[PDB]
Design a protein around this ligand. Structure first.
Ligand code: NA
Ligand code: NA
Ligand code: NA
Ligand code: NA
Ligand code: NA
Ligand code: NA
Lengths: 105, 105
């Protein structure tokens, strides 16, 4: 106590929906809720309860296979800010350069 | 019901602390807590309880005066994800291209 989190982001004019609609492949969705706990979803395939290092492995694998892959962070409206910063840092550590942020029911 | 929020972000290698430390001027901090309610802080000067359109006016004014200005979004660890997406969209609408995200006590 107390550790704070930070991340720098750039804001492009291109949109989250544009990224998804213009891509040949489904997006890879990193869903957050669970303190440092993630579900990775690609279409119907769900990889639940993954710890940070396993999310890095999964995401880095997909980015290497196709760097054009669209990555999204999904979560309920009330997911804590600190968890969102952690997730952005996690994705950047795995090599991801662009992310769509979206809230979900 | 139900409106969701989204924003696309790019992840540069440059950091939030780097942006602040390398700048000649203090950062402009948009603090969030309050549903669509913001405090804009520059050094000791606080502009509290600003509605979205007033934040846009204040931020756009500072960006026009100096486009090298460092903009930050500050908030407690538990600020809701949806409010963070709203704040990023608000800043981008005012012309801001880079933002540092940081949690605070
Ligand atoms: Na960063
Ligand atoms: Na793997
Ligand atoms: Na997280
Ligand atoms: Na966007
Ligand atoms: Na003004
Ligand atoms: Na907000």
């Amino acid at each position: 106590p107390i550790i704070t989190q930070s991340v720098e982001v750039d804001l492009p004019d291109a949109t989250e929906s544009q990224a998804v609609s213009s891509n040949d492949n489904p997006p890879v969705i990193v869903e957050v809720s669970g303190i440092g706990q993630y579900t990775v979803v690609v279409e119907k395939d769900r990889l639940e309860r993954l710890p940070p290092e396993q999310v890095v492995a999964e995401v880095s694998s997909r980015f290497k296979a196709n760097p054009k892959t669209v990555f999204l962070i999904g979560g309920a409206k009330d997911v804590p800010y600190d968890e969102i910063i952690k997730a952005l840092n996690l994705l950047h550590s795995a090599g991801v350069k662009s992310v769509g942020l979206m809230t979900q029911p």
